[PDB]
Amino acid sequence: MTTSERVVDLLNQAALITNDSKITVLKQVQELIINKDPTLLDNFLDEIIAFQADKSIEVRKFVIGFIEEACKRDIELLLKLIANLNMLLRDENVNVVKKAILTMTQLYKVALQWMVKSRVISELQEACWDMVSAMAGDIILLLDSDNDGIRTHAIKFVEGLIVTLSPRMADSEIPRRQEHDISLDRIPRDHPYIQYNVLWEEGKAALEQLLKFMVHPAISSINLTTALGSLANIARQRPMFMSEVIQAYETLHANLPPTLAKSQVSSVRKNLKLHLLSVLKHPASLEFQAQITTLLVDLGTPQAEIARNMPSSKDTR
């Protein structure tokens, strides 16, 4: 029997399995159609995507993972799969939503790169980009989800967005895994469709949402520390934002979220200090030395710890 005959037989078996172990069979299918005979991907998309209706949470999560792998293998499948991903982002179960946010964090930057490399934008490709972009806007709105784990994942997606939609600079720290990710500097300024200025504004607006979130008197401990880490990552990857990040830290410290200001205060300060020190260690910090140092002392950072983390101006070259 042929590969596509095997795929049909596995799919028919997966349909008879009544527990999550059907994912074993679906991953066999995914390996056949994504890696063994990639030409089959197109032919059996419908069959895999059909499992987005499965009642099992792990099965819907599998389908989100599958969409990510398929779009990473052929980004144009995003044309037929963005709508299914949008349904999973609105899932009734928060674990499916979280997994869909993870996936958008990966796929947004790849759809954008694809738009940026197209000189002529088809109707399908335009509606696909419109949807990618409303989904990003909806995930930013998820900063106000009533679910703590969703807000946490939204923070990370928003972090990734701010970094995508701002330019790399010469002293930008770039985690090696993100070396080849698109950023604003890699966007031609006369692309007829994707407008540089608009994406910049959009990155700035995303950052303003994340700064406001950070300050909010009602956010939780896990959200706060995720946001603090995100802001620190942003300041080191995009040093043009360092000022705004330092200021956000000053502001959080002046106005502690009432629920975290007594028994939890030691923890919040230790967290704020650890993140602030990571910013200080970045050479662009030398421009804000008095402001950072003053904030570090006010948090009760020992002098030795400030001194140890101060970058040399040699690292400014």
Residue with tokens 């056949």: 32
Which residues have CB under 8 Å from 209's CB, separation 6+?
140, 143, 158
Question: Which ranges of the chain does DSSP label H, i.e. alpha helix?
Answer: 3-16, 22-31, 41-49, 57-73, 78-89, 94-117, 123-141, 148-164, 196-215, 221-237, 242-254, 265-280, 289-298, 303-309
Q: How far is CA 177 from the centre of its chain?
A: 14
Q: Which two tokens stand for residue 64?
A: 């989100």
Please tell me the total count of domains within the chain: 1
Contact between 32 and 7 under an 8 Å Cβ cutoff? The reply is yes
Q: Which two tokens stand for residue 133?
A: 């972009």
Give the CB-side neighbour count of residue 136, counting CA atoms within 13 A.
25
CATH number at residue 298: 1.25.10.10
Instruction: Classify burial at 102, counting beta carbons within 10 Å of its beta carbon; exposed 0-12, middle 13-18, buried 19 or more.
Output: middle
- Domain boundaries, position 228: 1-317
Residue with tokens 């996936």: 103
Q: Write the DSSP symbol of residue 315.
A: G
Separation of first and last alpha carbons in the chain:
64
Rounded alpha-carbon distances, angstroms, from residue 168 to 175, 184, 236, 300 = 12, 7, 10, 33
Instruction: Classify burial at 231, counting beta carbons within 10 Å of its beta carbon; exposed 0-12, middle 13-18, buried 19 or more.
Output: buried
Which residues have CB under 8 Å from 243's CB, separation 6+?
288
Elucidation technique: X-ray
- Sign for the CA dihedral angle at 76, 79, 84, 88 comes to positive
Which residues have CB under 8 Å from 16's CB, separation 6+?
none
Contact between 154 and 101 under an 8 Å Cβ cutoff? The reply is yes
Determine phi and psi for 193, rounding to 5 degrees. -115, -50
Q: What is the distance between the alpha carbons of residues 295 and 105, in angstroms, rounded to a whole number?
A: 32
- The total of other beta-carbon atoms located within 10 Å of residue 72's CB is 14
Contact between 265 and 288 under an 8 Å Cβ cutoff? The reply is no
Q: Which two tokens stand for residue 190?
A: 């006369």
Q: What is the distance between the alpha carbons of residues 102 and 57, in angstroms, rounded to a whole number?
A: 15
Closest CA to 145 of 250, 45, 220, 197: 220
Give resolution in angstroms: 2.2
